[PDB]
Design a protein around this nucleic acid. Sequence first.
RNA 1: GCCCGGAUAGCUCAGUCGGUAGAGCAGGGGAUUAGGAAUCCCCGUGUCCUUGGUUCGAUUCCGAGUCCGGGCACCA
RNA 2: GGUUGCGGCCAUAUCUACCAGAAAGCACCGUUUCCCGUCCGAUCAACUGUAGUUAAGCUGGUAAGAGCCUGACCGAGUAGUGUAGUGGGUGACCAUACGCGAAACUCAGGUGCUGCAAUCU
RNA 3: GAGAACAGAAAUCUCCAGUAGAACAAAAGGGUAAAAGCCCCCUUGAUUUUGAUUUUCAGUGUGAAUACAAACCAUGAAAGU
RNA 4: AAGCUCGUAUCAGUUUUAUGAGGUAAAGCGAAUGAUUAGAGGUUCCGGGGUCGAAAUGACCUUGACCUAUUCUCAAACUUUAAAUAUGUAAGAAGUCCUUGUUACUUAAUUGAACGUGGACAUUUGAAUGAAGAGCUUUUAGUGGGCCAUUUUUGGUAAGC
Lengths: 159, 209, 169, 294, 58
Amino acid sequence: GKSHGYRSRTRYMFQRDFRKHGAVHLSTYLKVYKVGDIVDIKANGSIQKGMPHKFYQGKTGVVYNVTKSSVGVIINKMVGNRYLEKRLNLRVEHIKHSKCRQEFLERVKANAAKRAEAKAQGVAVQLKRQPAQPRESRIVSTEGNVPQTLAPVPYETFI
Amino acid sequence: ARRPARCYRYQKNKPYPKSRYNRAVPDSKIRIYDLGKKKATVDEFPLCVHLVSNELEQLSSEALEAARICANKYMTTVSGRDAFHLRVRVHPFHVLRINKQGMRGAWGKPHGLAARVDIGQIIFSVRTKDSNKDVVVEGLRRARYKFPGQQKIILSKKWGFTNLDRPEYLKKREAGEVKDDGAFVKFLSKKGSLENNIREFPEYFAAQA
Amino acid sequence: QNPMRDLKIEKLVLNISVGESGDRLTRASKVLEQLSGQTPVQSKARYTVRTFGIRRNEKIAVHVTVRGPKAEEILERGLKVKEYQLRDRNFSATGNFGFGIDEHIDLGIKYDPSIGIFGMDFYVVMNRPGARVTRRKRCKGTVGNSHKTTKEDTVSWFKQKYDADVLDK
Amino acid sequence: QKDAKSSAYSSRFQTPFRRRREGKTDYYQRKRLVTQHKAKYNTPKYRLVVRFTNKDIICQIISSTITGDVVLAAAYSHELPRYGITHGLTNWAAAYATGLLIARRTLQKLGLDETYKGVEEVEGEYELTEAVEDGPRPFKVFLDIGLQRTTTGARVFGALKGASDGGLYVPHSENRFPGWDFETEEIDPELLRSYIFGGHVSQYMEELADDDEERFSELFKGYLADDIDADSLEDIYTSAHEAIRADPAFKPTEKKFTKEQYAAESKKYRQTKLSKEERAARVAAKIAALAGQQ
Amino acid sequence: AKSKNHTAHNQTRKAHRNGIKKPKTYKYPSLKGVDPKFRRNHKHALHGTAKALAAAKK
RNA sequence: GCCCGGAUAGCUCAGUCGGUAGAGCAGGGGAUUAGGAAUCCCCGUGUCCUUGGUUCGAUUCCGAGUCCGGGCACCA
RNA sequence: GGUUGCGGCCAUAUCUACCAGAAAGCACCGUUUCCCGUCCGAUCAACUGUAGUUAAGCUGGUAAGAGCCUGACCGAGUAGUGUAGUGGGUGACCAUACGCGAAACUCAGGUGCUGCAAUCU
RNA sequence: GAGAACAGAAAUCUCCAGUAGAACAAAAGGGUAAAAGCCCCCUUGAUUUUGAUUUUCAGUGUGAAUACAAACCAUGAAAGU
RNA sequence: AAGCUCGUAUCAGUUUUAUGAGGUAAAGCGAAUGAUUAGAGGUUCCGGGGUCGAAAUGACCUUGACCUAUUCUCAAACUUUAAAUAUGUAAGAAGUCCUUGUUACUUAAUUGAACGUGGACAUUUGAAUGAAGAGCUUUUAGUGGGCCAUUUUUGGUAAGC
């Protein structure tokens, strides 16, 4: 009949990072996760304990609890027309920090430094992110870069 | 019965090959894919004529066999068995089903095999000498009646059946970068270990003649 | 050239394959026990087959490891029976070598009817020191080529000492 | 040797970790020794890595880090001469002494040496360093063997006894020490005290001193040179312990030919690799040679 | 007599009418399923520190 | 036409989880006996339907072709 | 800079062949009373550092080497693809407009980087 | 692969290669090499209290599973499981 | 439908930026697996069918299987690699930092963990666009037979199936 088990449709997802089988390296276990830390989920088929359901593969949540080998993660899941708060209990092999906040915090520190400099100098900060603007009026020159004129080429059989 | 070929002309279903899941299929009608002077050095037959599909469709093994036979008969009658090396550059791997007292459990049983063909896809190809052009073109032209679709006939500017258009081939052959394997060539590269590069191509950096 | 790679035996191993279990196998075990001085070490079946009248996990055969100068003495004994005459196949590409024989009585051990008569397979293994690189846990390794006993090397050794005589090839 | 591992084999070979390729580390053991309760979040799990060469013992206190392991203190068997043990520096007694040394050294450099004074009345009795109420807890450290086999009668456990007797809380059972009757399940402290202070060696010295003296000369020649008999060994090791308990520190060596000197002359024998022009030149020369139909 | 069995037509739109809205965070969240150890301790800690910041008002 | 079952000496029929080709009859030669039926004996003879894989080796393991043999769809 | 020990990332680190390796170190190596263990002191255990050795292990170098890694207006803006049309075509299927954009290949280049401590001419 | 008496396609004993092509009760897939496979020692964590969570999902149950806590135990030299 | 609390407050079927995950299209098989054509040469080790003195534990043939390097074509349940579109998370005042308070938990430890005190950092509160508001609750009808188009797509020869 039908088949809707826990690890259903999980052939290639928890298939393993070709030419990376083997006992997992130890930076995984030496990493440290405090409460209020954002973590991306990427399962490991070599570690059957503490696993997540396939739904939470590729999602990113916040830790709410920490134990001996595992952490407790808050996710928000879309169900129909609402979001539900889910609490997973995962061993840490399936887990890694999120580089997004690292980027935000770098921008924060840079903004602070620029503000201190402008506060020091009585000048302007303008330290939000602006988008990509089009482009100003440039001038090329034909000194040496002469225009090579082109045309289409006709149809030939290259079989 | 062999119901018609419009029922299986087009690529409507995914590919369904003979496998551990689909076993108990019949065997192809076409089993011979290479004919003529198959044992011909690459130097014998510089010319080549490709028969290329313009339509996206399926071709029955039966039709493939028929065209092979007709072409071969034209060659062997006109120019002889040893004036060409015809190669069939398509294999029937796609299995076709029939349903054959209700539409319930209508999953069909294997009827036959077909090769799945794209635009620009080679179907037959020939490697003759330059004096059999009008004959091989007519052979393939006669073959065009034994296929559905549209199947054009192209004169290939290459040396035969491997690659390397004629002047490029001549540079390498005169420069000695070529060894003749059985019916096909091996080339000299500049990557491998230099000893064996020489012991397969002693000439390249040797004053050949 | 020859400081340390001079040459040596690693060990010798003798094999007596009955083809069944029971009295005969234990008798051959006694053979090996008295012959070695070591208490022997048996073998079992791998998978049941009808042609041999055997079954899986059956103690069919016995063998034993002998090593050291005792093994060398007993090697000399066996070679006396082999008449200082050996053939070419007979010989690993890895240099190890061996042969086979009937009536174990022929050297040392007298007859002992209760034991009953058997033959046996001899096979000895050559090496050089530093071989325990391959066997030691820490820094397990593998041999170079300026080392690595082989057929011709062991043949030359085997003729050099024992005043031996190789045969056809 | 014809076994030519093809391009495909090489392409789908997964290399092990470097330390397994070498053959020096079990990462299985390493995980189950390093993984810390994450609700401690940075509490380093200190391991006593004990290694046995053929001519040197290595005792080191180690923590782990993403960048690499980190050593808190270290102790070698060639250092016991500064406490008065010159000969027999891979034996049980030197193992004990090295354990005592690293033990007393850590707590000294850490500030705990006033408390956790260990036993200091050695009789070979199994006992751990209890915790001082109204005071700090004892330092916890877990023995890392490595690839060495656990057997009863081994010299790793001499070092274990030394570390435990020096003041560290080193968790261990007594069922792999020597003199442990197994069917009884009971340790013999007098035998352990003998193995600490060189009783089996000293007994053996007397035994060869009346069984065969050529052998006694060839092995104990350093003892014979330095005017050492069997029964001096207990007093020797005791004095060594006393000096260790006095000053267990790490006074290092003096390093004639310092760092740059070593780099300058003690390592200028390696061949640096060629350049691209040099490879091309070698190939050009090789074709200039190899150009013959032979 | 058969009948269509499943589909998801129109459901997305139905949701999006008054739909998905948002998981509605708050400051000071729950302690559901947290380690009862460190719950038990954090309690005593808050008791003591509240006592402290109280007694600091005389 | 689909659901199933068979293909062996000249005919008929046997195949230990594969090592081999079995039985009778038809049929040559006696034997027999004063002669002959009778019978006892021995000549043989067979891709074990067809080809394909199948393994060390398949004729007995499979898939396809062929010639047959047993069913089948109710109620208006 | 070496070497050792503990490691990180875990092939730019591997594999095949062939060279070299001063200092020490490691390793081989010497033995079998005790602990212990093996059929077997081979392994494992124990004693010595003495009897001998770089031959091997180990390090590095070498090969238009395999493999691996990285890169490129090499392939290829191709294949494929989101959206549009009362666009074409009997149809298959195809082109066109705005956008995204490959892998194969080719060519080039490289072949372990490194943390803590100890020791080393 | 090379070798060895009976002994051969194949019995048992060697040495080399062997990234897993083996095995892990079973269907398929994943996973796995100083193991999760093979041998051997000891064990009864297949136990006790009552909660949380995930999948199915109505965020109901059942089933199954994960992670903890207070207990009692095993095993190991220990970390630990 | 009734509304309720607030009101510029936090939002949004959207993009952008940064970061993640995926195994479909595609591509590929001289990369694994499976399938498959052609030849190469090599398989002294003999597995098979021959000749050579019935001779062969010996050479010459064909003939396998294997070895090496090549070659043609393929996959819903094969894949190294690996798109487009889609998809999750962050874009601060509920913040950034300092400070040192607590605690039966944790530490060798005034170490840690959590949670707080006090102090500095709002013109730009810190991408774009919009916001005819944002949030919340109760209650109840009707519905719980569906159908067509484009594109992807399953069965079927096919269908206004």
